[PDB]
Amino acid sequence: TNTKGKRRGTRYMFSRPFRKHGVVPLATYMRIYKKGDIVDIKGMGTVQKGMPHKCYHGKTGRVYNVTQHAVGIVVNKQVKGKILAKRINVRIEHIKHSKSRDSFLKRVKENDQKKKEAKEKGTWVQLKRQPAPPREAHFVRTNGKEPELLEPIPYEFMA
Amino acid sequence: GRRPARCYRYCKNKPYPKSRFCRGVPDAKIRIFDLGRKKAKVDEFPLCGHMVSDEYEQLSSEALEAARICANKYMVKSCGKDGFHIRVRLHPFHVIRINKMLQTGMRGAFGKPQGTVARVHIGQVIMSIRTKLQNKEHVVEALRRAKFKFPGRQKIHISKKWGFTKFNADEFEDMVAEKRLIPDGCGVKYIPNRGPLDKWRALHS
Amino acid sequence: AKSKNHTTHNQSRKWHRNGIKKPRSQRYESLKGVDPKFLRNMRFAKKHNKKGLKKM
Amino acid sequence: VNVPKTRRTFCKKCGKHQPHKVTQYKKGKDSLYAQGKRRYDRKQSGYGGQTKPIFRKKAKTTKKIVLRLECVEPNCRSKRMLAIKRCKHFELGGDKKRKGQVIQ
RNA sequence: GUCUACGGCCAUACCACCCUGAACGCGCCCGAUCUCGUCUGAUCUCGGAAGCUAAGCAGGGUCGGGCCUGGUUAGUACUUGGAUGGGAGACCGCCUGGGAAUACCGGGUGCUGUAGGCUU
RNA sequence: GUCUCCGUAGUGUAGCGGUUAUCACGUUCGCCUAACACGCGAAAGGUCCUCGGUUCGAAACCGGGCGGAAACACCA
RNA sequence: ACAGUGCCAGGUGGGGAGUUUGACUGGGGCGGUACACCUGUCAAACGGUAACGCAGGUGUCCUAAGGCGAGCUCAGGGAGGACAGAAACCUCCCGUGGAGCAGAAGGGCAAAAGCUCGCUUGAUCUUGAUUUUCAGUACGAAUACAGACCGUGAAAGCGGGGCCUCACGAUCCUUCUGACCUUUUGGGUUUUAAGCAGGAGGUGUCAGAAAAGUUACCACAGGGAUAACUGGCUUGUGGCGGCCAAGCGUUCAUAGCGACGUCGCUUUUUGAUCCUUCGAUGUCGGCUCUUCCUAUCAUUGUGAAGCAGAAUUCACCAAGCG
RNA sequence: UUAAUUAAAACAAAGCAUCGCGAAGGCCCGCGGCGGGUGUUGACGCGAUGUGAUUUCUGCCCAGUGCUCUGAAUGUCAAAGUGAAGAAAUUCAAUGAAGCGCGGGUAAACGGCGGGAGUAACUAUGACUCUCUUAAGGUAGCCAAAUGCCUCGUCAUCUAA
RNA sequence: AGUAGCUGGUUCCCUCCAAAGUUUCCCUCAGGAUAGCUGGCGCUCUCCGCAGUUUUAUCCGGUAAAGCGAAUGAUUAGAGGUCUUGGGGCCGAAACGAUCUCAACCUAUUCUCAAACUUUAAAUGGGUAAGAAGCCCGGCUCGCUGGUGUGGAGCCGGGCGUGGAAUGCGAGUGCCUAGUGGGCCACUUUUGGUAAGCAGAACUGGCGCUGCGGGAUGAACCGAACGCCGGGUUAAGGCGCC
Ligand SMILES: [Mg+2]
Ligand SMILES: [Mg+2]
Ligand SMILES: [Mg+2]
Ligand SMILES: [Mg+2]
Ligand SMILES: [Mg+2]
Ligand SMILES: [Mg+2]
Ligand SMILES: [Mg+2]
Ligand SMILES: [Mg+2]
Ligand SMILES: [Mg+2]
Ligand SMILES: [Mg+2]
Ligand SMILES: [Mg+2]
Ligand SMILES: [Mg+2]
Ligand SMILES: [Mg+2]
Ligand SMILES: [Mg+2]
Ligand SMILES: [Mg+2]
Ligand SMILES: [Mg+2]
Ligand SMILES: [Mg+2]
Ligand SMILES: [Mg+2]
Ligand SMILES: [Mg+2]
Ligand SMILES: [Mg+2]
Ligand SMILES: [Mg+2]
Ligand SMILES: [Mg+2]
Ligand SMILES: [Mg+2]
Ligand SMILES: [Mg+2]
Ligand SMILES: [Mg+2]
Ligand SMILES: [Mg+2]
Ligand SMILES: [Mg+2]
Ligand SMILES: [Mg+2]
Ligand SMILES: [Mg+2]
Ligand SMILES: [Mg+2]
Ligand SMILES: [Mg+2]
Ligand SMILES: [Mg+2]
Ligand SMILES: [Mg+2]
Ligand SMILES: [Mg+2]
Ligand SMILES: [Mg+2]
Ligand SMILES: [Mg+2]
Ligand SMILES: [Mg+2]
Ligand SMILES: [Mg+2]
Ligand SMILES: [Mg+2]
Ligand SMILES: [Mg+2]
Ligand SMILES: [Mg+2]
Ligand SMILES: [Mg+2]
Ligand SMILES: [Mg+2]
Ligand SMILES: [Mg+2]
Ligand SMILES: [Mg+2]
Ligand SMILES: [Mg+2]
Ligand SMILES: [Mg+2]
Ligand SMILES: [Mg+2]
Ligand SMILES: [Mg+2]
Ligand SMILES: [Zn+2]
């Protein structure tokens, strides 16, 4: 069997990228995390304190507690046939604001403005996204040039 | 002394180099990969034939040694000791193990090193011969004979590259005229339009 | 005698018979595990809410 | 392991850091009239032979060292147990390490 | 056009060598009474203002190395799903989708926030 | 094959992590004897089996080799 | 006044009694520990993932090798300098770490996490939450805080052990520490004893019995979950046979042989495995008797020889008869 | 002698050699006693062992494990008794039976009884020597013996083999 | 009526639902406890929520491949310098004087490689989001933080429905609970072994528990899953005769 070691199998996961070792940029420490924020967990091997467990590397959670150096994250973990909402304490080095919801918040603001602005102009605008439709009919001009004829090439043993 | 080569023909195990974990590997049967007139300049042997593997398999260091002798002797007899240069293009790095039986059985069955083999892919060159353009017939015959020392199917192919270089034979001469190629013994260094202009001055002075 | 050692064969089939249900979500989460110093003041903030009742 | 014979650490009686005398803890001799030793004697009497297990399969080769602290305040003299990790060799107030010395 | 202090990203910013640097700066620089520290006022600390851009530093240069970024490599290698496909096998082809990396060729060579100067 | 152990002057052997690498025999030089032996006074001579490693320092301690020697190998 | 006997106490006591004499395991035993743990790989780019899989490590070590601060920069190399030489010490230059950080490995680290100094004991007291294994139990280890006392620094801060990943232990019992503590049974005082809380004494079979053999005089319950025949898959080993052709054969590769290599066949060898049989398939050899195969020793009909004859060798059709 | 798979080389045996015991004893039985067997006995006896007629001989080892003998000289050592502290429970000390330790004896008690190298004027051996070594280092005998793996040992005899 | 974690047996019909041979602990390995898988009883609602799926956003990763004129490790061949070190020579008085020559060394190239290497780097894959529990305003509480009426959280009132991707589908929740805890087979991936109808894993699907058409025959292959029937048409397979 394997060992139950805490950091087994993290040889590459927690190592620093190529030529990106050394000091941690201080903007990592200047980010503002608030209750309810969505953060991507990513263990950084440079700082060994508050390291998230390997199972949480690459998961995205929600901030619920904020301390001097770390935050509390509610992150789903699947164990066998059930999913548990787990609460981890992770130093802010090993997290980053998730941009998954930013596209949504951008859309909400755009939606509301169009909803508000169109209302005063008495028009119905589309708000819901849609899947990419089949492309509509169109014309392809030849510009007086015959399409290039293609043929398969002969085999050659370029060994 | 060793098992029939059918036992270790196929690439069934991951590559198993002689490393700090696999200790006690006996030396490979083949120790010489270049023979003939190795010191001939790039311009003396424009022709190159290849023995190309048509299968994904393992060749034993014993069969590499056997083929090398087979191809080398025929060339010495039909072209002279100074009329060719042979380069075996496979090195036996993968190690094959043996679980020696006389009795535990299959308990503790991991095997000790038994030998070495080269893992060859389809379309991969097994060995190469460069010589003069008038010995094209003797190159094919040398490589045709050497095929009988290897399992599986191998194809002979006369390359379009000049000798053991990576540059096509139909233009190699033109590139050397304008100093895009610089002979450096058996091969040619490539001169790009890059780097300090001093190096250009040296080539043109 | 010897027997099988371990497997997870048939396990994702059993897990999905009653579905891999996500955890239940309520609009109010428990304050369990939050900073004790911050929770102490939040209780004090609630405790005196009624002081500004008339002003509200 | 080498430990100083004094250390300024926390005293519970005083509620503040105080100097402490440090010594090794030693198990006291067993009382004949402790309830556990009285029950054992009565059960071991008469016939029946041994009645409790006798442990044989010892495995540990060291013990956890417990340091007996005492507050040096003449009025307090409170004591506390402070266990440290396992060690084969333990001493109190041994010679302190020196750096850049020739070893003879 | 540009610098000083403090920075963000952390080579398009690095490394080697060469050229040029108005003004103010930043420096080199001159000393050791005091503060401070040394085997040594070299460094560190302190007090200064005779000299100099020599160097640091700034800008530029190099068919420059690196680095960043494209092209090619190549719809190649690899790959998800399919067949009562081929082949003794090893393996390979096709159908349905995804899709790399060298060598080789080209382009680029720091951006910028806060505050404060110089430059008619 | 599994397990345990051993390699030190020419021979047989000690070495209680810091030695001028112990003892006996052997070899050499000189006395003694007409000579030999015995004996007396001196001298020399260790690839610490080999490679690597920990250590401030390895002949020793720990691993990989090279030879050697024991003990086992049963129920059919 | 002892023998002796009654009752206690210490020794002896397989004469006798009871009982035990681990587990995993390509049968069991012997051997190993894959039994509690840790690193890399396997492992198929979340996590998880087996084998007596592979390469290794652990039961320790540290008054500093813990904590803070400051100051420095390492391995290696180049070039110089009395003795000084490959190697002593001094100087300048290059040096992205190629060093060091107790140890296995992997990760991390350069005005530091390394080295050297100065001061120190955050390796202290305390309640909860969390993570890892996970049953979302325990321990162990670890993470964020919170409340006190502190250290260090000019300060921001950092620190409640070791840069991170291992370095460990329930109940019962014993021992120590703590309180103007509770109980100590009708009340009171006092010794004692028992409670409550936190350490330690240990269970390495490491969620934790107290444990030697032999049986061929043997027994029961079972097992084809499991060994000793046959049979089956496989064919490494054994046997037999091809292909290439360096050589041998005075000459001459192939009359006859044939290295280095390589492709097969057979199940008359041994293995490997454990599929059938343990509410029983009688276990070696010989004798006797029939039958079948051909990979042919002889005989019939043939081809080739380094076939003059004779003798012999190679090969073909061939298992009728020996 | 294994009734009913073993008739034997197994057991017994005379012979031989040990050992205990002089009776309030040795050896043994018995739950029990002024109990019982040997014993209607007395060392030419009774009890406990080994070997196994005769013949010849029975070597060395007391370190190990046993057995045995001497003991206040004398480490450890229970209860009881003695002394001191205390309110007592209790604690502490002093003393010190056997047995263990200590020292002798004993192998017809259980048992045990080496290794390396050099050396004689052909070669071979090596009487001889050196060395490490144990409590002795296997002596007189005997042997491919019912005991020897290698092994169907080597030589001779017995056969055509 | 000793105990038996072991062998054997365990008696009527129909209807409905329907497993497991896996996790952890156990002197645990032929057995238990435990979670999972099952059944039954319901209840709380409904006529927003959810999903073994895709889309759109956004992260995570170090395998396939590739690389080695990039680090580590292994490795073939020549070429140019070379006094900075050696072996041979070699003319001497002789030296770092001359002379080559072969080596080490250095610089560019070159052949071949890695499960316990790597700058790169897929496919398949894992997490999250796609709103009313949202958005936007005004106010109030604080013993927390604080140059600031700053920050943060909490609470009160108010206003906004184009319910803000596709598709499909009613959901939530609680008790009690048996059997199981020997598995085995196939595509792909994969460890050991010469290999095995061998031993050990991942994924899905199967057999076990399951008939039926085809593969002559057959646990697993191919097709397809089953109330009792009539007609029609098919799948995989077939159409000389059987
Ligand atoms: Mg394999
Ligand atoms: Mg099982
Ligand atoms: Mg008693
Ligand atoms: Mg000026
Ligand atoms: Mg100065
Ligand atoms: Mg200048
Ligand atoms: Mg450039
Ligand atoms: Mg610039
Ligand atoms: Mg007894
Ligand atoms: Mg008994
Ligand atoms: Mg067993
Ligand atoms: Mg995966
Ligand atoms: Mg520092
Ligand atoms: Mg605190
Ligand atoms: Mg440290
Ligand atoms: Mg009273
Ligand atoms: Mg018997
Ligand atoms: Mg027997
Ligand atoms: Mg079976
Ligand atoms: Mg068999
Ligand atoms: Mg064979
Ligand atoms: Mg010839
Ligand atoms: Mg099986
Ligand atoms: Mg039967
Ligand atoms: Mg029969
Ligand atoms: Mg029968
Ligand atoms: Mg025939
Ligand atoms: Mg009988
Ligand atoms: Mg009879
Ligand atoms: Mg006797
Ligand atoms: Mg005798
Ligand atoms: Mg004796
Ligand atoms: Mg004997
Ligand atoms: Mg004799
Ligand atoms: Mg005789
Ligand atoms: Mg005889
Ligand atoms: Mg009954
Ligand atoms: Mg009964
Ligand atoms: Mg059982
Ligand atoms: Mg237990
Ligand atoms: Mg059964
Ligand atoms: Mg990996
Ligand atoms: Mg690869
Ligand atoms: Mg299998
Ligand atoms: Mg069943
Ligand atoms: Mg089913
Ligand atoms: Mg079916
Ligand atoms: Mg068929
Ligand atoms: Mg019909
Ligand atoms: Zn105190």
CA–C1' D14–I71 (A): 60
Q: Which residues have a C–N gap over 2.5 Å right after them in chain D?
A: none
CA distance A41 to A56: 7
Distance of CA B204 to CAs B42, B172, B176, B183, Å? 21, 19, 13, 15
Q: For residue A65, what are the contacts with CB-CB under 8 A and spacing of at least 6?
A: A35, A71, A72, A89, C33, C34, C35
Kind of pairing between the strands at D63-71 and D16-24: antiparallel
As a whole number of angstroms, the distance between CA A150 and CA B189 comes to 38
Q: Which residues of C25-42 are buried (b: 16+ CB within 10 A; e: fewer)?
A: eeeeeeeeebeeeeeeee
Alpha carbon distance A72, A65 (integer Å):
4
How far apart CA B175 and CA B179 sit, in angstroms, is: 6
Query: Rounded to whole angstroms, what are the CA distances from A109 to A12, A34, A118?
Result: 40, 20, 14
Binding-site residue positions of D = 11, 14, 71, 76
B95 membership: H or E segment, kind and range: strand B94-98
Is the CB of residue B49 less than 8 Å from the CB of residue B71?
no
List, as one string, the DSSP characters of A97-155: E-STTHHHHHHHHHHHHHHHHHHHTT-----S--PPPPPPP-----TT-PPPP--PPPP
Q: What residues of C are in the A interface, CB distance below 8 Å? A: 6, 11, 14-16, 18, 20-23, 29, 33-35
As a whole number of angstroms, the distance between CA A73 and CA A102 comes to 19
Torsional sign, CA B158, B85, B135, B182? positive
Q: Show the tokens assigned to C29.
A: 């989460």
Angle at B181 between CA B178 and CA B186, to 5 degrees: 145
Chain B contact set for A157 (CB, 8 A): 52, 155, 157
**For A18, how many CA atoms within 13 A lie in the half-sphere containing its CB?**
0
What distance in Å separates the CA atoms of residue D40 and residue B86, rounded to the nearest whole number?
92
Give resolution in angstroms: 2.8
N- to C-terminal Cα separation, chain D: 22
**Residue D86 neighbours by CB under 8 Å, 6+ apart:** D62, D63, D64, D65
Antiparallel, parallel or unpaired: β B57-60 and B112-120: antiparallel
Q: What is the rounded CA–CA span in Å between residue B106 and residue B119?
A: 27
In angstroms, the Cα distances linking A50 to A23, A30, A88, B71, B202 are: 17, 17, 9, 66, 61
- Angstrom distance (rounded) from CA B65 to CA C36: 77
CA A44 to chain CA centroid, nearest Å: 17
Q: How far in angstroms lies nucleotide I114's C1' from the CA of residue B22?
A: 12
Token pair listed for B168:
């096509």
Tell me how many degrees the CA angle D5-D8-D10 measures, rounded to the nearest 5.
125
CB neighbours of B59 closer than 8 A, spacing ≥ 6?
B90, B92, B117, B118, B120, B126, B150, B151
Dihedral of alpha carbons B139, B140, B145, B150, sign: positive
Q: Are strands A95-97 and B112-120 parallel, antiparallel or unpaired?
A: unpaired
φ, ψ of residue A94 to 5 degrees: the values are -90, 25
